[PDB]
Amino acid sequence: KTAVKQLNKLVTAILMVVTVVIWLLLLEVATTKVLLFFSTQLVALAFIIGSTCKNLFESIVFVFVMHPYDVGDRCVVDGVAMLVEEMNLLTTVFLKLNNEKVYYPNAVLATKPISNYFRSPNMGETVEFSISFSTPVSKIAHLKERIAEYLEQNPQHWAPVHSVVVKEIENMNKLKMALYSDHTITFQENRERNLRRTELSLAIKRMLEDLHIDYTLLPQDINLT
């Protein structure tokens, strides 16, 4: 609404200038040299002011045509999570997760990709863990079964669909694991996201501890002298 009011004021100013100048042209009181002088003054003016009108017009197009976000939603720019409160023609104002207030230019944002959390569907989160190369396959199967059971027992926070994937083996000693699961929310609900992720991490820890799964460094042999 603030952007709409500012645009209305700007276009009213443009209307005023154009109507007055064409009224003066209808009057036709200026001399021939005077009219040409005003025309060349307009030419010189155009360069300087249109140079900034480039940024101004592309910012209008970005705000109204693209319309990537609205006031109150959470967005990501260059990997940082922020919130939005204000919408001005030349600038937008955001809050970082620490409530730090920032003032962006709108032309710069037009060149950059932007993610919107409020407009996104339910999401997925990944928790990382590693286990030793000596782990038997049966233990891995039991871990998968327990993870599926736990995710089934908590339909409030997690979707039934999930996946446990294996990643490359390091020195044939370390297995790198990752669990993929989907919230019932987006990242707009930041505190709930973090709390639920913490609970899931604690559950995975309890699992890997009560299933007798251990990780160890590589053995070292030594020659004494």
Add this chain to the structure above:
Amino acid sequence: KSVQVFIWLCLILVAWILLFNHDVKRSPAATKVLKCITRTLISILTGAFFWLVKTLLLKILAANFKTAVKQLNKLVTAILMVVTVVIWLLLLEVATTKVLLFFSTQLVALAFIIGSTCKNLFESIVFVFVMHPYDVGDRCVVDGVAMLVEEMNLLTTVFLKLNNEKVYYPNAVLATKPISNYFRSPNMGETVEFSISFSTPVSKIAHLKERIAEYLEQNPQHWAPVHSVVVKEIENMNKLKMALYSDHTITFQENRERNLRRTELSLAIKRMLEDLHIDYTLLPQDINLT
């Protein structure tokens, strides 16, 4: 004052025109003098008009918003002077046709060079007055460095680093970059980092959370009741990485208070983790001797 000056100038011009309109110069030479007088009256009326509109613009800009205002006033007064004198000369029309075209092409060549810098100058004006991201005395961040502000000039702004180092930025460069303002921001949040071993029981974690909540409740002066303790990824199934999120009753504008309160919170967390019998250890190593 400006309105009265404009009214008086218009009245004088009208009186001169009416006197010279009812009676016209008889001698051919007198006609030139009358034309010059009429041109002078028109030029004076114009100049007063430009001065009045310039004053109105300056006052509305000031109301919307001091050194920058004075510098802008001087610049616009210079522009007013040049425009009024040139259109007075045009009214005189003493230059020859080739001379007028020569001056026009000189203006064309001039425009490129000077307007090239006027690009930066005008975008800096727009940045300072339209965007208006910060005021004198507040603390801002540019490229992750915390600095203070004292000065506001049309082409440049001056800042102090946390070590009091004085810097002189261009305003055009800042227009392209994002800027954070601490004085304009609400109460903030700070995070203290710590790690604990994978063997820690859940009951110990619950006790730690309870103690942290209690401590933050006992200190409403510095901290908000709302807080959160989050867990981060597990390293080699040996290290748990933790972080505590809490909100000050201040912003980062109060730097020394911020740092002192953070130090006190860190000391409290240390005392906690020490008196709760929580220990961290490296992974065990097995060795074969020969």
